[PDB]
């Protein structure tokens, strides 16, 4: 029954966060974040909206999707890179 959609207001913030994550990834010499991750973030936000039968995605859905994907991306890295990432990414992995 449920087929959610995005809201066009906060997507500017998502683009800024995507660019920031890419800049930080390059700055520490990590393998870069990609468009596949951004697509996955939007898809997971849709799934979170579907879970409560909401036809709208919301800011908290995007926040939770961002946390899931960012944490998953962090877990793949080497230990020194992992520490730099979590120190910088604190405003996404824990805060928003």
């Amino acid at each position: 029954k449920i087929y959610p959609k995005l809201h066009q207001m906060d997507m500017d913030k998502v683009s800024r966060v995507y660019a920031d994550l890419r800049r930080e990834s390059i700055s520490t010499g990590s393998f870069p974040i990609t468009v596949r991750h951004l697509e996955s973030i939007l898809r997971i936000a849709e799934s979170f909206a579907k879970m409560r039968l909401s036809e709208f995605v919301s800011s908290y859905d995007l926040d939770r999707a961002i946390k899931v994907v960012v944490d998953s991306f962090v877990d793949a890295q080497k230990v020194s890179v992992r520490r730099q990432l979590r120190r910088s990414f604190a405003i996404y992995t824990l805060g928003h």
Partner: protein
């Protein structure tokens, strides 16, 4: 007995009289077909229904019996409009009745006209059926003949001219035959119930309907649905088909010629290649040369001179996809290959056989490799022959053959193997936040200069029209430069296999202008672009 004559008379009067406005459309079609030696007629159901609904009712009730009567009526008209000898004409039908999904056909539909659609998945070779056939009687040596027609027969046993229980044999020396073909139709992919593999049917066609389709094409079919012999009292179903549905102009090359005389064309083509990728000017220039290529040549002593170009790239994932889209022919692969053939080829096993990888399959076109470092051990040695000779040769387990490998290779990775390429470059990056934001905004838009097709057609046109030659000035320039670099290196390597690469680049640059001769203008940019390092 009389009914066979009244029905034939009726369809004969149909063809002679059906006007819509002022043209006798079936008389005209039947005449125009004979002039090009096409013996058939394409009738439309709606016109037959409009003319007289009773005829359509008879046809709809008993199609196996009535289709032959209408075919012989066509022959009787064909003689009047063209003779003051002809075979029997084929009737073909068009219809707009409701399509039946292939999965719903059942016992209610046997010997009914059915309209359906699907995908052709297989095609048989042609085979011969008899129409007029001659007979010899073994005992008395009397002779006679029979006329077959292909609707749902065996040799007779009423002996003539006692004459015996089964005395008839065929004179193949005085008999007439037609073509027949078999096909397989599979139900539409977007119809199948979930979790099930698609159902399919088998079907037959003859004469002008043969050799009209190829595997993998979607089609619509009109035909009689029927059964044949091949549990208890049970038979296989099939369909008899009655109808099927499925270089440059002057104004094109005028645009290509206008492009050819533009003073900044080289810049325009470079700008048009992967426009989202920032920077990397010389990479784009090298891809233009790889797409355009040099000129092939053949000498009086039979030696053969290569035309292709080869480039290596050390972001980079996007360019190979772009090259795959713009090129007239293209193949894309990762270093491990699509099978145990790898990139080049291998022998496999039970008797042995051989299969080629993605060097043989791209013959005549372009091939791009996505991680050249993931090349397998056999391919590491075999690519030397594939690139230098444009061939692959094998003599293993009794196999002894040579394969063609005429292609231009684009490759990327992250040693001595670099010597195989004409140019090598390392991809470079820049980190402007506006670029990422623009990409992200476009991604959200889909989630919520020259174009590719025109450029591909232009590249095709240039490859077909021009193959330019070095002017003498270019020869003096190149030879002087060659000895200069070798002398400089000697007092401090360049080799003939690289001079012959610079020549190919020079020719490819002259090719954009469609200039029949290459000039010092091109030589300068060729050596300028040769700075791979």
């Amino acid at each position: 007995d009389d009914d066979n004559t009244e029905i034939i008379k009726s369809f004969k009067n149909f063809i002679l009289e059906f006007r819509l406005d002022s043209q006798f459309i079936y008389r005209d079609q039947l005449r125009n077909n004979i002039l090009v030696k096409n013996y058939s007629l394409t009738v439309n159901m709606e016109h037959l229904i409009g003319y007289n609904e009773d005829i359509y009712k008879k046809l709809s009730d008993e199609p196996s019996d009535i289709i032959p009567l209408f075919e012989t009526a066509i022959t009787q008209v064909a003689k009047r409009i063209s003779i003051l000898s002809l075979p029997t004409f084929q009737l073909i039908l068009n219809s707009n009745a409701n399509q039946i999904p292939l999965r719903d056909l059942d016992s209610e539909h046997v010997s009914k006209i059915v309209r359906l659609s699907g995908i052709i998945i297989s095609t048989s070779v042609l085979s011969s059926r008899a129409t007029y056939l001659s007979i010899m009687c073994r005992n008395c040596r009397h002779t006679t003949s029979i006329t077959i027609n292909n609707f749902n027969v065996s040799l007779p046993r009423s002996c003539l001219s006692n004459c015996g229980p089964d005395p008839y044999i065929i004179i193949h020396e005085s008999s007439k035959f037609i073509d027949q073909q078999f096909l397989k139709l599979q139900e539409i992919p977007e119809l199948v119930p979930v979790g099930e593999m698609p159902r399919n049917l088998t079907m037959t066609c003859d004469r002008y309907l043969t050799n009209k389709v190829i595997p993998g094409t979607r089609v619509t079919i009109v035909g009689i649905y029927s059964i044949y012999n091949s549990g208890v009292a049970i038979r296989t179903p099939y369909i008899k088909i009655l109808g099927i549905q499925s270089m440059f102009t002057e104004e094109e090359e005028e645009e290509f010629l206008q492009l050819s005389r533009n003073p900044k064309l080289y810049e325009i083509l470079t700008n048009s290649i992967a426009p989202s990728i920032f920077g990397n000017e010389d990479i784009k220039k090298a891809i233009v040369c790889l797409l355009m290529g040099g000129s092939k040549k053949i000498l009086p002593d039979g030696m053969r001179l290569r035309g292709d170009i080869n480039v290596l790239l050390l972001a980079k994932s996007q360019l190979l996809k772009f090259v795959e889209k713009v090129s007239p022919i293209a193949v894309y692969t990762s270093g491990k290959g699509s099978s145990a053939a790898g990139l080049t080829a291998s022998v496999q096993r039970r008797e042995f056989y051989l299969e080629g990888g993605a060097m043989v399959l791209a013959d005549g076109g372009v091939v791009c490799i996505d991680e050249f470092d993931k090349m397998r051990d056999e391919d590491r040695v075999a690519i030397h022959e594939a690139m230098e000779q444009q061939t692959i040769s094998i003599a293993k387990a009794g196999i002894t053959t040579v394969l063609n490998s005429r292609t231009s290779v684009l490759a990327a990775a992250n040693t001595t193997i670099l010597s195989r390429f004409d140019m090598i470059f390392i991809v470079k990056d820049d980190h402007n936040e506006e670029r990422d934001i623009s990409i992200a905004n476009h991604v959200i838009n889909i989630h919520t200069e020259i174009s590719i097709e025109k450029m591909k057609r232009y590249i095709t046109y240039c490859r077909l029209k021009c193959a330019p030659r070095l002017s003498p000035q270019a020869a003096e320039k190149l030879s002087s430069n060659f000895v200069t670099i070798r002398k400089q290196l000697l007092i401090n390597p360049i080799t003939i296999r690289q001079l012959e690469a610079i020549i190919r680049i020079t020719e490819s640059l002259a090719k954009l202008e469609l200039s029949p001769i290459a000039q010092e203008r091109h030589v300068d940019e060729a050596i300028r672009l040769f700075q791979a390092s």
